[PDB]
A paper describes a structure:
To better understand the role of the subunit interface in translesion synthesis and in other DNA metabolic processes, we used random mutagenesis to generate a series of PCNA mutant proteins with substitutions in either of these two β strands. We first measured the growth rate of these 17 strains in liquid media. Twelve of these strains (A112G, Y114F, S115E, S115G, S115V, S177G, S177L, S177V, G178L, G178M, S178T, and V180A) had slower growth rates than the wild type strain of approximately 4 to 5 hours. The remaining five strains had growth rates similar to the wild type strain of approximately 2 to 3 hours. We next measured the UV sensitivity of these 17 strains. All 17 strains had increased sensitivities to UV radiation to some extent compared to the wild type except G178M. We then examined the rates of spontaneous mutagenesis and the rates of UV-induced mutagenesis of these 17 strains as well as E113G and G178S. By contrast, all 17 strains, except the S177G, S179A, and V180A mutant strains, had statistically significant defects in the rate of UV-induced mutagenesis (with p values less than 0.05). Five of these strains (S115N, S177V, S179R, S179T, and I181R) had complete defects in UV-induced mutagenesis similar to that observed with the K164R control strain. A defect in UV-induced mutagenesis is a characteristic indicator of a defect in error-prone TLS.
Numbering used by the authors:
A (entry chain A), B (entry chain A), C (entry chain A): 1 to 255
């Protein structure tokens, strides 16, 4: 029997929020040590990998491994019934045909139980993470969110360019252009509003603006965003969770 | 001459709010003791009955009975010009071709007068209320509003099921299901957040979700909603006013 | 070299806000003493004239006259990247093919530079302002905004009628009508919530509601709106700036 209870029903919405705007159906592999889920969009340029440690829950028990794939369109709907902060509990049994989503408020006088029809879905799980990435930077997810949204106003191509201690986001549009140059530093009022950067090799990569706009959905999960870039390999955008994370592997343009 | 002055122009909007989302044109029968209005949607499954006592107004005078039907689409527009809390006064004269809507703010420096073209509309007035209903429950309009909206996410059929001291709202969708079970009790911090229930006979009725979503429009009028259910007859959803009320007679599915 | 720095990037948005909803492309004539810009909609019934004095800026330098026309659709986009209050600086050089828009926040750690492709656009500049207008009134831009929006709910024709110490806005719709009568007076709690009126000759003019709705866009620029009316000539709607203004010349209907 599976019983995964999020303390605050909100974060389960926010994580499937990063999924739904691109990927469609997705296998959630639940095992004793937590949940992992992976999905890839149609064009196979964006790959979303989730990991939820047991410490991210209020309570978690999984007697044995249970893979439960499901339509995020249908799931999200049940997550609309979820008014935020209602101890959402995922419940399933051995070889289940359905998953139960159970909400509960502070006052016991209200409790709602929902059920979601599951799917049989093959999935060739991927493991494309590199050992080392040419560059690695950390910045506020709100800042990165802004940069993407603003430069997205122009052409549908944003070009990240990293030289030593210099990160440069550029969009060159048909109507005009825009460039945001930020630099690594250290804050103290809130050290987690600062910018970090480790550069083994400089990078000059272009990404589809459409997808960068979808990657920043996860900015509601963490204060920071972890971007790892490689010239030959897809970029790793990561939003860290209390235990585990939400990753977005994006392939840069060929050009 | 007719002169019906609502103290706060808002509530006249809110009551025609319950109408407009379904019914079209509607005769407002004005007489010495107040206003009554009745309308039925196209499919004749929803009937909306209004009653406004004189105490619901700031001032009210109707020298003799005057029936004034009017298009709610056109009326609502004039009620958009009404910025909330502006002593809305309905004015008409003997055998009138038009009704005058008169707004006024705290500061005399602003006063707006509007006129609405009336209609000649036959209406076979209905009186389908039963003497006794198999079950009768009272709950917060906000709670009932939530239950409908959430279960409406699934299939377009919500099934209310009442056994002794057990009210059960269920929606069984193609993608999944949902069930909210509430029970009668008594609160004291706010006794009008509690749940009441008188059960002469148990009921198992299904209603079109579309209409239940329209019935909960009136939740802006009262803290509570009065639901009376009968197996053979249409259900009575009622939002009580200071004097008078707003009722929704809904026919359950045949199944 | 041109360097026009608005203290608060917001007001440059708000002024092109009055333009964009009607006019398309527009020459911004920049010279030593400030900026002027003029544009006319397709039907040639609305003419928008802008003037920005040097005192409206934080800093301003224009070594010599430079006319820079540009698409407001494209400009507005770059002004979306502008988060309010970011010292927007317009930068250009001799005979420029592009204009640079430069944002900057309180904290130096963020600075964004954008570029907008300019256009070659002929413009026969107009000077249709009369010496004297039959009537001239001043009222709160918020009040005038309300009157237009409300009476716009009815027919697409609003008729302003001014007799001595009596301003009367009337819309006579197919469904119904509405009339707002205001009078000149003097306040003291806030003397700039009052109503002024100088009447040399009475006027009875009708204006297209579509355009009056576009003229009130500028209500975000000033507390008051200056309306000058003439029977034979187009009306002058003006929102005063710290230095300079934003004018809307509207031609009344022939009828």
């Amino acid at each position: 029997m599976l019983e995964a209870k999020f303390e605050e029903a909100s974060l389960f919405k926010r994580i499937i929020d990063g999924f739904k705007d691109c990927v469609q159906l997705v296998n959630f592999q639940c095992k004793e040590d937590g949940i992992i889920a992976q999905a890839v969009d149609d064009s196979r340029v964006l790959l979303v990998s989730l990991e939820i440690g047991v410490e991210a829950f209020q309570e978690y028990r999984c007697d044995h491994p249970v893979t439960l794939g499901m339509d995020l369109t249908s799931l999200s709907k049940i997550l609309r019934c979820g008014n935020n902060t209602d101890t959402l509990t995922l419940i399933a049994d051995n070889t289940p045909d359905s998953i139960i989503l159970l909400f509960e408020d502070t006052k016991k006088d209200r409790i709602a139980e929902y059920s979601l029809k599951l799917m049989d879905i093959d999935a060739d799980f991927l493991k494309i993470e590199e050992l080392q990435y040419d560059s690695t930077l950390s910045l506020p997810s709100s800042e990165f969110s802004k940069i993407v949204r603003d430069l997205s106003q122009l052409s549908d191509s944003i070009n990240i360019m990293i030289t030593k201690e210099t990160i440069k986001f550029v969009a060159d549009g048909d109507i005009g252009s825009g460039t945001v140059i930020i630099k690594p530093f250290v804050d103290m009022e809130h050290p987690e509003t600062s910018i970090k950067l480790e550069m083994d090799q400089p990078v000059d990569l272009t990404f589809g603006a459409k997808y960068l706009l979808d990657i920043i959905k996860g900015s509601s999960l963490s204060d920071r965003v972890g971007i790892r870039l490689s010239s030959e390999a897809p970029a790793l955008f990561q939003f860290d969770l209390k235990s585990g994370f939400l990753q977005f592997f994006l392939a840069p343009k060929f050009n």
